[PDB]
């Protein structure tokens with residue numbers, strides 16, 4: 575069985591999840607809309623849909639470029655989504671006692687490392703693998719011959735396949751958040767025992783709640799998924815810095831987290 579402090583751990587995570595993750599995106603408003611290395615971007619093409627309160631529907635089909643400049647038509651908006659996401663992610667971290675109790679300099683450092691990952695983890699819960707779309711309340715972002723060649727895309731598909739519970743998602747969010755090996759983490763021992771206790775909790779939760787043979791090695795699959803995601807996080811920083819080189823798009827908060 576799952577021990578007392580393990581039940582205690584999950585419950586504080588599930589709580590911070592519900593307090594800070596607006597699953598319907600009700601409060602995403604005031605966002606901008608569309609008025610050489612770029613295989614980076616073209617693999618990530620999406621169409622956008624806004625359902626009005628009243629029943630109206632607005633749709634955006636992006637331009638298939640051969641030229642150069644129209645690939646950016648959607649970055650202002652994406653930069654607005656990301657800011658709104660990162661704010662929820664920060665609120666999530668600060669509502670966790672394990673996190674509050676680290677030194678401030680460590681708070682900042684853990685966040686700057688995992689913000690993207692926690693965010694991609696949340697988007698996975700609103701992803702629909704049948705239709706290749708992220709359903710964000712009134713927004714939908716729909717992927718423009720099955721190409722899991724883009725690591726980020728293969729990540730969402732593979733992870734959705736595992737059909738995790740909300741508790742498994744929030745714990746994954748914890749392991750990723752409390753990673754001992756992120757630039758400028760002073761308290762590497764604490765953050766390391768903390769991560770291990772989250773991992774152990776995940777391991778037990780699975781042993782206890784998923785007894786069926788399809789859920790063999792799930793804990794290990796999840797753990798590999800998280801390793802994959804760290805790799806994708808680093809590749810994405812490099813892509814993003816390249817976009818900044820040629821055009822500033824990053825909101826203040828994105829500059830704060832990506833280190834500029």
Ligand SMILES: CC(C)[C@@H](NC(=O)CC(C)(C)O)C(=O)N1CC[C@](O)(c2ccc(Cl)cc2)C(C)(C)C1
Nearest residue numbers: 618620649650652653655656697708715726823824
């Ligand atoms: C997973 C990927 C297809 C995409 N997601 C979406 O388009 C849908 C949604 C916004 C819901 O995540 C996404 O967030 N990535 C990472 C973030 C991204 O690299 C990016 C985001 C904001 C800026 Cl300013 C630049 C780049 C991207 C180009 C929008 C692609």
